[PDB]
Amino acid sequence: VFHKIRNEDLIFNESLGQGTFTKIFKGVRREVGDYGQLHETEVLLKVLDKAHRNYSESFFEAASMMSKLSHKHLVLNYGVCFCGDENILVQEFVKFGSLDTYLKKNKNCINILWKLEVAKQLAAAMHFLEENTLIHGNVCAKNILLIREEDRKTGNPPFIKLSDPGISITVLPKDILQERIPWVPPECIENPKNLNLATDKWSFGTTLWEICSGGDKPLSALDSQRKLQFYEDRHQLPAPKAAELANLINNCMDYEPDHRPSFRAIIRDLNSLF
Ligand SMILES: CCN(CC)C(=O)c1ccc(Nc2nc(OCC3CCCCC3)c3[nH]cnc3n2)cc1
Numbered sequence: 001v002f003h004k005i006r007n008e009d010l011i012f013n014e015s016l017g018q019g020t021f022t023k024i025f026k027g028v029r030r031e032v033g034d035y036g037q038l039h040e041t042e043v044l045l046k047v048l049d050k051a052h053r054n055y056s057e058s059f060f061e062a063a064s065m066m067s068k069l070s071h072k073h074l075v076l077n078y079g080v081c082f083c084g085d086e087n088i089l090v091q092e093f094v095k096f097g098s099l100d101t102y103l104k105k106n107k108n109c110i111n112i113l114w115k116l117e118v119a120k121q122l123a124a125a126m127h128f129l130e131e132n133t134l135i136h137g138n139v140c141a142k143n144i145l146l147i148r149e150e151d152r153k154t155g156n157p158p159f160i161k162l163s164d165p166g167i168s169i170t171v172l173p174k175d176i177l178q179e180r181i182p183w184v185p186p187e188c189i190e191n192p193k194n195l196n197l198a199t200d201k202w203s204f205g206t207t208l209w210e211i212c213s214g215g216d217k218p219l220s221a222l223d224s225q226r227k228l229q230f231y232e233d234r235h236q237l238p239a240p241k242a243a244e245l246a247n248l249i250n251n252c253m254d255y256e257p258d259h260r261p262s263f264r265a266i267i268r269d270l271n272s273l274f
Contacts (some may be wrong), residue, residue: 002064003079005029008080010044016097020166020176022059024082029078029090042093050064055167056087058077062137065091065162067083069132073125073176075145075163089164096149099160100141101209104215112244114150115211117157119245120270125162126204127263130197137195138165139203140183143208170195182206182218186256189231205264207251212240212249242267244273 011028018024021268032038048059053216060080067077076092096102100119103110127134138160148159169177169184170192174236177184177192185202187194208219218237219227239246248269254260261269 002060002067002077005081007083009083010043010045010083010088010090016044018045018126022166023047027090027094031242035059043045044091044093046089046091048088050085050272052107055171057172058213062093062166062168065134066136066164068141069128069134071125073121073161074126075161077164078234079134092161094145094147097230098142099144099146100148100210100215100217101210102215103141103213104195107214110214111241115242115245116270116273117256118144118160119208121160122162122204122207123263123267123270126127126200127267129200130263133197135195135197136203137168137170138163138164138183138206139200141207144207147165153220158221164213168195175224178224178228179255181222181224181231182253186231186234186255189228194257196245196257198260198261200264201260201266202254202257204263205249206237208245208249208252209237209240212242213244214241 009030013026013028016024025045025047027043029041029043030038032043045217048056060210063077066074078090078092080090081088108223123251126136126139143163143165145163146158147161148156150156150158169180169188177189181204183206185199188199206218219230222230236253238251248266252260252266
């Protein structure tokens with residue numbers, strides 16, 4: 001179970017946006033930390049809409065399953081306040097927010113080494129999940145959090161974490177899944193029961209496209225029906241302007257799930273582009 005956090009110790013501040021059937025807020029948690037020292041800690045607060053309390057189980061098991069596995073590239077969940085009528089997940093507050101917004105805002109100031117480093121870290125996370133046979137189910141740039149920016153002073157690389165998957169696509173409405181093309185793989189658009197470790201290899205390739213497309217969203221110009229016909233016609237995504245990773249993107253986004261390479265293989269491919 002998650003460590004239950006008192007409503008009394010949670011302060012909700014500015015709205016940061018919304019997720020799939022969720023409201024997200026910046027907040028502060030009053031807690032007793034190491035050595036009995038009192039802290040007021042910045043927290044990310046994800047609230048499940050009162051209008052969609054049906055997905056609470058998935059909304060919370062998505063964080064639970066990942067939280068039992070500690071890893072430097074996986075987001076830290078502090079606990080949950082079932083604040084009465086509300087279902088609230090309390091998470092590590094990352095300084096620089098989402099990768100997709102960071103890529104858009106800093107498109108002209110991001111080189112290939114920066115993108116390689118971020119891809120290697122994300123693949124390391126996914127490899128760790130693969131070794132544990134844990135399916136994420138929603139790998140995308142929005143679910144990558146920037147802990148530290150690159151530092152030209154000390155040449156330090158950036159550092160990222162993978163966030164929780166949110167409500168599983170197995171229970172999400174059909175219209176939500178279709179909107180998530182091309183992050184949801186073709187076999188899951190055909191049948192969500194096909195959720196598999198191979199799903200995350202496809203989505204990982206889609207996310208590599210985002211990292212190389214400076215924040216663009218692939219197929220954003222296509223409505224849901226045309227996104228479906230994109231999979232029907234078995235099309236592949238266009239090569240990004242920075243095409244250094246185009247081959248890996250296409251190799252991951254294989255219409256045959258069984259042919260998608262292991263994340264061990266993916267990592268060795270990334271290490272070879274130097
Ligand atoms: C100058 C503008 N910036 C940063 C360049 C910010 O406003 C900002 C936003 C969010 C954080 N922090 C954050 N964000 C998350 O998710 C991403 C958010 C979900 C809802 C959509 C908006 C992003 C998180 N998930 C788990 N811990 C999280 N911590 C820090 C800063």
